[PDB]
């Protein structure tokens, strides 16, 4: 594909009276998970979660583990500071989430770099697209913004996101190319289930596709039936692929007025389906 992404998603969750906050990190290339870390594991280390990662040598895993353990400590201290900023009790559990990563564009350059944090499920602070400034989501976060501006934190992220982030992504894309670079088109079909003598559910299926981005719409007389379509969230097959369906309930006598349209980057051109008894 012309563009690719790498992301790390970390979750830190405090548990007052029950030890250190738990720390979980997962990394993704596009929609494929490739590593994990869990501080509650027997002997916490960064671990592969895609087979093409297993060829990285031990020094790779040692450095990633060092960096994650570093982050874990930073984020535990951060949880303490944030409970201060927010005047909160030491008795309650709180959650710090971070996202970071890079999009590689077809010109081989950084399409966009990211670093953002959330506290208890809400935006807290984000690195702006320019990789030189911050958006604080509230007054508490302005504490952080001020500290980070003074410490030149943005420039450190800019260097990472334009350099090592992209270099790493390029390497993973090469090491995993046979699966990461293969867009698998959805297998599609329509099912039909009478709900009465007079109406039926037409369900449009898309199965086994990669990546997860897809558009599935029902149309009648060339117009989207979005407000009559039940559309489920795109969901994992469990085998690295994704699934989705969309359904409409229609009068039996007008079943052939309905067509399902599917768009996927793995498709030469959009598909058009219909109920075919």
């Amino acid at each position: 594909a012309g563009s690719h992404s790498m992301r790390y998603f970390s979750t830190t969750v405090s548990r007052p009276g029950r030890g250190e906050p738990r720390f979980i990190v997962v990394g993704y290339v596009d929609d494929t998970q490739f590593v994990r870390f869990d501080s509650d594991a027997a002997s916490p280390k960064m671990e592969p979660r895609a087979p093409w990662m297993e060829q990285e040598g031990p020094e790779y895993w040692e450095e990633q583990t060092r960096r994650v353990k570093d982050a874990a400590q930073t984020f535990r201290v951060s949880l303490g500071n944030l409970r201060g900023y927010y005047n909160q009790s030491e008795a309650g559990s709180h959650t710090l989430q971070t996202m970071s990563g890079c999009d590689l564009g077809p010109d081989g350059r950084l399409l966009r770099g990211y670093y953002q944090q959330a506290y208890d499920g809400r935006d807290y602070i984000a690195l702006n697209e320019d990789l030189r400034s911050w958006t604080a989501a509230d007054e508490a976060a302005q504490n952080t913004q001020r500290k980070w501006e003074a410490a030149g934190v943005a420039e450190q992220w800019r260097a990472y996101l334009e350099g090592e982030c992209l270099e790493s992504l390029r390497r993973y894309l090469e090491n995993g190319k046979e699966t990461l670079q293969r867009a698998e088109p959805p297998k599609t079909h329509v099912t039909h289930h009478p709900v009465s003598d007079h109406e039926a559910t037409l369900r449009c299926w898309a199965l086994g596709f990669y990546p997860a981005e897809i558009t599935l719409t029902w149309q009648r007389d060339g117009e989207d039936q979005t407000q009559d379509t039940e559309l489920v969230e795109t969901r994992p097959g469990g085998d690295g692929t994704f699934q989705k369906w969309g359904a409409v309930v229609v009068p039996s006598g007008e079943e052939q007025r309905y067509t399902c349209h599917v768009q996927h980057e793995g498709l030469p051109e959009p598909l058009t389906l219909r109920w075919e008894p």
Binding site: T74, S78, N81, L82, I125, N143, K147, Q156
Partner: peptide, 5 residues
Amino acid sequence: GGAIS
């Protein structure tokens, strides 16, 4: 990295 909030 080391950037505490």
